[PDB]
Structure 1
Amino acid sequence: ASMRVVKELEDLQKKPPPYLRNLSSDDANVLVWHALLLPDQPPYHLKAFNLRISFPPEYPFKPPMIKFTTKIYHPNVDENGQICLPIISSENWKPCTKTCQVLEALNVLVNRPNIREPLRMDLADLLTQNPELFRKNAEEFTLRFGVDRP
């Protein structure tokens, strides 16, 4: 169970992606990962967003629940910090898939918003109407409830 988690962490801590920094285990939990996501998409590239990866005791049969610790104004993220990633959903999941692959999918969805199946119809509609207005709101939010860019 945790054995694979330790391996995945050990591997990722040696060759971390340019969009994932400060990746380490929780102070009192090896099943909880702590990392800072560095989106390149504007204006999310001005700051960083901390994410909390929660590994289930039935790993890897059960998908790791990833949530945002900080607050990201993205149409694919909720006001609390929940997300809808098909790669780790109860509708689709493969035990052969490693957390590294999930992190990639997450990064892609964070950078490239999905106006087809979003978590915020309001933000999705706004983005598909006025990118500048949306950018303004997202910018102030990123520089308000976001972690400093590492």
Structure 2
Amino acid sequence: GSMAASRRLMKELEEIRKCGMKNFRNIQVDEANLLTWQGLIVPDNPPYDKFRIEINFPAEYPFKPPKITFKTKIYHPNIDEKGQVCLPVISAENWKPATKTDQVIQSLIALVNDPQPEHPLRADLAEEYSKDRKKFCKNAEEFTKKY
């Protein structure tokens, strides 16, 4: 039953162990659970150059999406203070059982390089990005460097 989700990840990992993601590094997961992973999303495009995501795989996987959640304080209009993210790829409208993880991340990553107020999870700085940009980039490199 739930031994089949662990059965796929195993395959998915070795594929990463070889090639490797260049924008996602340091994936640590004990061979016991395997229903959850830890890691670091280290972006190269400012203002986030100068985050510990914790993707949690479900049991019925891969017939449900993974729940990527942030264990680090972030200043994004798409990331709730609880770490929650409203991602399209891991959303129950675009989910095909055939999606890898190197794709679910390449998506969650390219999101920070070009955010979207279309599906914002916080009205705290949604309009902030809208009207004054320099105010979201002179107020971002700060919050990024404080935590």
Q: Given the two structures, how large is their TM-score scaled by the length of structure 1?
A: 0.87
The aligned residue for residue 17 of structure 2 is: 13
Pick the aligned partner of 2:44 from 40, 47, 50: 40
String of CA shifts for 1:31-66, please: whole Å, max 9, x gaps: 2111111122321112xx111011111010111111
Pairing of 1:99-110 with structure 2 (within 5 A): 99-110=101-112
Percent sequence identity over matched residues?
55
Aligned length: 143
Q: Deviations over 1:52-91 (max 9, x none)?
A: 0111110101111110111110111111100011211223
Given that residues 21 and 35 in structure 1 are in contact (C-alpha distance below 8 angstroms), is that contact kept between their aligned partners in structure 2? Answer: yes
Secondary structure class of the residue paired with 1:88: coil
Which has the larger share of strand?
Answer: 1
Q: Once the 2 structures are TM-superposed, how far is the Cα of residue 9 of structure 1 from its aligned partner?
A: 1.7
Runs of 4+, deviation exceeding 6 Å: none
Aligned to 1:92: 94
For residue 26 of structure 1, report the CA deviation from its aligned partner. 4.5
Contact 1:13-1:23 within 8 A present in 2 as well: no
More helix by share: 1
RMSD of aligned Cα (Å)? 1.6
Distance in 2 (CA, whole Å) between partners of 1:123 and 1:33 is: 29
Equivalent residues of 2:21, 2:102 under 8 A apart: no
Per the alignment, residue 2 of structure 1 pairs with: 6
Structure 2 unaligned runs (5+)?
none
Higher relative contact order (CA 8 A, sep 6+): 1
